[PDB]
C-alpha cells in the first residue's frame, strides 16, 4: 500500500505477511473457485504494482494458471502501449511493475493528477483471473442438471455457483436464470416450478419447491 | 470503513483480511443460522457499500442464498429509486455500490448533512439475510415438540432457536412463548408447567421443570 | 467502545471481531460455567449498549439461557423506568440499547456529568448471567460429597467450583466453607480435617490431608 | 494497564482478550507448574487491581487453588491494614481492588507521589501463587532420585524443576544443589560425580556424566 | 526495518516475531520451492542487514542450503570489495552485516545520498537463494513429460513449476514454452496441440486440450 | 523494550505475550538446537534485563539447561564486577537485572552516554545459550559419517547442522569443512568429491555428487 510518512512525503507500506499468507491460502485451497476474484480485490485494496506482483509471485501451485495470468497481463500491457504511445508516461511494463521502480510507482500513484498504476494493473490481473476462473470451472451451466432425488436448494447452489464462472453478459445470465434453471430441474420439481409461471423470483421458486 | 487522513481529508480504510476471513468462516460454517445477522452487523460496523459488497462477494458456498440476497437488494434498490426520483443524489444502484465509485460513497457518507449510504445498504442486506435465515430454518415453531425423554432445557433451546428464525412480529412471538411453549411440551412436563399458571417466566418454567 | 476522534469529538470504536470470536467461543464452549461472568466483564470493558447487544446477539446456542437473559434485562429496564420517571433522560429500553441510537448512547456516556448507560446495562446483563450460571449448575453444594477413594484436592475443586455458582451471600458461603467442606469429606479424610479444629485455613486443610 | 489519553489525563487500558486467553491457557494447561509465576508477572506487567482481579477471576478450573489464593490475598490485605492504620489512604481491600473503584485505583497509581496499588497487589498475588506452586508440586527434592538406567540430564531436569517449587532460601537451595544432587544420583553416575570433587559446576557434572 | 522516532531521528524497528515465524515456516515447509524467493522479498521488504541475517540464521533445517547461501554471500561480498576499493565506505562484510553495527547500517541506509546496504545485501541473498532453488529442483525441464493418462493441465502445472526453477534467460524459456511444452506432451494430446500451429497461447493450448 | 512516552520521558514497553509464547514454544519444541540463539536475539531485540529475565524464567522444561544458563550468567556477572570496581555504576547483578529496578535499568539504557545493560546482559545470556547448545548436540562432527545409501545432501545437512553446534573458531571450522566433509563421505561418494580437488565449493560438491 501507500502511506504518508510523518516527515510529509509519500511512502510504501509493505503488504502484511498476514495478508500474503491469507492470499496464498485462498489460491492454494480454493483453486480459482470464483470467490478468488473478490478475495483478490479485498486483500489487494491499496496495492502498488510491486504489491500486486508480490501477491502473484508467492503462489506456489497452479503454475499453469499463473502462466495464463502472466501472458494475459502481457497482452493487456501491449494494448496499453498501443493505446498510449510515448514523471514518465508509464509503459505497460511499468504498470505491470516489471520495468518500473517502487519509487516510480508511488510517484505515479501520488501525482497531482494521479496516474493510478496500481488500479490499472489490478484490472489487468482481474481480467486474467476471470479467464482462469472460467477455465477451472469443472462443468458448464447447460450441463448442470438436478438429480431425481436431489434437493432443489442443492441444485440451485450448483447452478448459481456455475453461473458465477460463466462468461456471458448479464442479459444472457438473466436468460439462463429464467429458462435453464427451470428446464434443468428434475421431473417432479420442474412441475412445481412451471406452476409458478415465468415471473417467479428465486425465493418463490425455492420456497414453493422446498421439501418436494 | 472510513478514516480521516492526517492530511485532513476523509479516506477509505480497507476491510481487514482478518474481518473477511471471520465473515467467510461465519457464513460457510453457520450456514445462515440466525446468529449470522448479528455477526454481519458486528463485522460490518463502519462499512462503505464497497466493503459490504466485498463481504457478500467473498462468500463461496450458498450461491442460492447469495442470489436471493442480490435480488432482494435489487428490489430494495428499486423501491429506493421509486421513493427518491432524481454530490449527486444517490440512485438505489449507487447505494448498493454497483454504479458508484468508492469516492462517491465516501463523499455521501461524509457530506455535511451525511447521506449514510453504508447504513442504508446494510439495512437492505439485513432484510435479505432475514429472508434467507427464515428459509434456511429446517423446521417451524408449531412443529417443535418435546420428546418424551428429552430435557425441558434442550426443548427450550430448540424452541427459542427456532423462534429466532420465525417471521412474525413480537406480539405473535409473545403469544408463541406463552401458549406454544407449554402446549408442545411432553405429557409429564406439560403438567408441571400448567401447574404454574399462565404468568410463569421462562426462569420459573425451567427451574420448576428441571430434572422432570 | 468509545474513542475520541482526532477532530476533537467522541466517536464509537467497533467491538473487535477477535473480541466477538473470543466471547462466542467462551459462551459456546464453557456453557455458563461461572468463569463466564468475569470473561464477559473483561471482554466488555468499554462497551456501549450497542456493543453489549452485539455480544449477546452473536451467541448462537443456548437460546433458552439467552431468553432468560433478555427477560431479566426487561425486568431490570422496567425497574429503571419505575425508579426514574420521565440529552434525553434515558428510559430503561434506551439503556438496554433497543430504543436508543448509538449517537444517543455515546451522548449519554460522554455527557459532562456522564450518564454511564454502558455500565448500567452491563450490570443488568451480569444480573441475568448470574441467574443463568446458577441454573446451569449441574448440582448443589449440599450434594457435593467426596468419594471414598477421591483425592481431597479434587473434592475441594468440585466444592469451590460449585460454591461459585451458589446464590447465597458471603456470610452463608463462609458457613458453607467452614461446615459443609468438612462435613461432606469422606470418612478417612474427615477425621484428618476434624483433628485440625474449626479454625483451619484451606491451605492447612489441603496440606494436612494431602495423600490421605 | 494505564495509558494517558490524548486529552491529557490518565485513563485505563483494558487488559487485552489475547492476554486473558493466554493467561487462562497458562493456568489451565500448566496447572501451577512454577513457570506460572513468571508468566503471571509477564502478562500482568502494567495491571491495575481491576486487571489483576480479571486475571484471577477468569480461571475456570483449580478452584481449590484459586480459593487458597483469595484467602492468601485476604491475610496480606489484613496485614496491610494493620501496618497502615487509617486521594484516600488505600485500605488492604482497596489494594485488592474489591472496595475501590477503577478511578480510585488509577488515582493512586498516577498520584504525584505514586501509591502503586497494582504492584502491591501483584506482590500479594505472587505470594499466594508461590504457596500454591509449592503445594501442587507432586514430590519433594529429597525424594527426587535417579533411576539406574536414567540419563543424568533427565535426572538433573527433574531435580531442578522440583527445586524451583521448593520453599527454602537460596542458602538452603545452594546446599541442596551441592549435596543432594550428588547424593541422589544412581550408583554408577554418583561415582563419576564424586570423582570431580565438591567444587564442580553443573556444566562440569553434566558433561563429565554425559553418556554414562 | 527502519522507522523515524518521534524525537526526530532514524531508528530500528525489530523484525516482527510473526514475520520470523512466517519465514521459518516458509523455508522449513516449502523447502526451497521457487515461491521461497518471492516470500523472502515480501517478508524482508524494509530489512536492514541485521534483519536479513536474523531471517537467515533462524532457519533450523537445510543447513547444506544455508551454507551454500553463506558462501554465495561471501563471494558477492568479495566482488563488492573488488569493485569498491576503500560514514565509512561499507566493505562487503559491512553490507553482509557481519562487520557493521546496526547503527552503521541505519547510518548508511538513511544517509543524505542513501547507501542502501539492506537492498544490496538482499540482492546477494536472492542470488544465493536462486542457486539453491535450482539445485533443490528434483527434475529438469527436458525430463518433464506427460503421462499417457495424465490431464494436460496437470502436466502444464508440472512443466511451469519446473520452468520457474530453471536457470536459463527468458529467450531460452520462451523457446522452452514454445517447443518443449508440445514436444513432451503425450501422444494423443500432442496431436491436439500440433493442430493449433506454433502461435497458440497457453490458454488456447489448455482449452483445446481440456478433457482429451 | 523501551519506548518514549508522549509526555516526553523514557518508559518501559512490556514484552508482548505473543513474543513470550513464541519464545517458550521455541525453547520447548526446538530443545536448544542451534537456531535457538538467533531466535533469542530476534525476539529479544530491544529487551531490558527485566525483559530478558522474563524470557528465561518463563521456560518451563529444560531446568538443567536453565540452571547452566543462570550459573553462566553469575560467572559473567562476577567477571564484570572484577573488571568494574565500584545513576549508579551497575554491578554485575544489576546488569543481570536481579539487584536493579526496572527504573534503574531504563535509567542506564537511556543515559546521555548510554550504559546498555540490556545488550550487555543479552551477551551473557547468549554465552550461556552457546554452552547449552554445544552440550545438547547429540553427536560431534568427527562422528558424522555418511551412510552407504544416504544422499550426499542429507549427509551435508547433518554435517553442517552439527558444525553449527561445534565450539571451534572459524579457522578450525574451515579446516573441518575442507577435510572432514570429504573424509567422512561414503566410499562411492568420496571418490566423486576427491575428483574435484581441494578447492571445490559446497555447491560444486553437492551438484557433482547429486544422485550418486
Numbering used by the authors:
A (entry chain A), B (entry chain A), C (entry chain A), D (entry chain A), E (entry chain A), F (entry chain A): 1 to 86, 96 to 221
Paper text:
pmcThe mature HIV-1 capsid is a conical, fullerene shell that encompasses the viral genome. It is constructed of a lattice of approximately 200 capsid protein (CA) hexamers incorporating CA pentamers at 12 highly curved vertices. The surface of the conical capsid is dense in protein-binding sites that mediate interactions with host machinery necessary for transport of the capsid through the cytoplasm into the nucleus. Here, we present structures at 2.6 to 3.5 Å resolution of CA hexamers and pentamers within in vitro assembled conical CA-IP6 polyhedra from multiple lattice contexts differing in local curvature and geometry, alone or in the presence of Nup153-, CPSF6-, or Sec24C-derived peptides.
We obtained separate reconstructions of the pentamer and of the hexamer to nominal resolutions of 3.1 Å and 2.9 Å, respectively, and used these to build atomic models. In the hexamer, as in the crystal structure, interactions between neighboring CANTDs around the symmetry axis are mediated in large part by residues P38 and M39 in helix 2 contacting residues N57 and T58 in helix 3 from the adjacent monomer. In the hexamer, K30 is not a pore-facing residue and may interact with E28, while E29 is freely exposed to the centre of the pore. Within the central pore of the hexamer, we also observe two IP6 densities coordinated by rings of R18 and K25, but density for IP6 coordinated by K25 appears to be weaker than that of the pentamer suggesting lower occupancy. The spacing between K25 residues is much larger in the hexamer, and its position suggests that in the absence of IP6, it could instead form an intramolecular salt bridge with the exposed E29. In the average hexamer structure, the R143 sidechain is placed above the helix 8/9 loop, with Q176 pointing downward. This is the conformation observed in all lower tilt structures (and in the average structure shown in Fig. 5E). The dimeric interface formed by helix 9 is remarkably invariant across the core surface, and matches the structure and minimal plasticity observed in previous studies. At interfaces between three hexamers (independent of tilt and twist angle), helix 10 engages in a symmetrical three-helix bundle, held in place by a hydrophobic patch which includes residues I201, L202, A204, and L205, as previously observed in helical arrays.
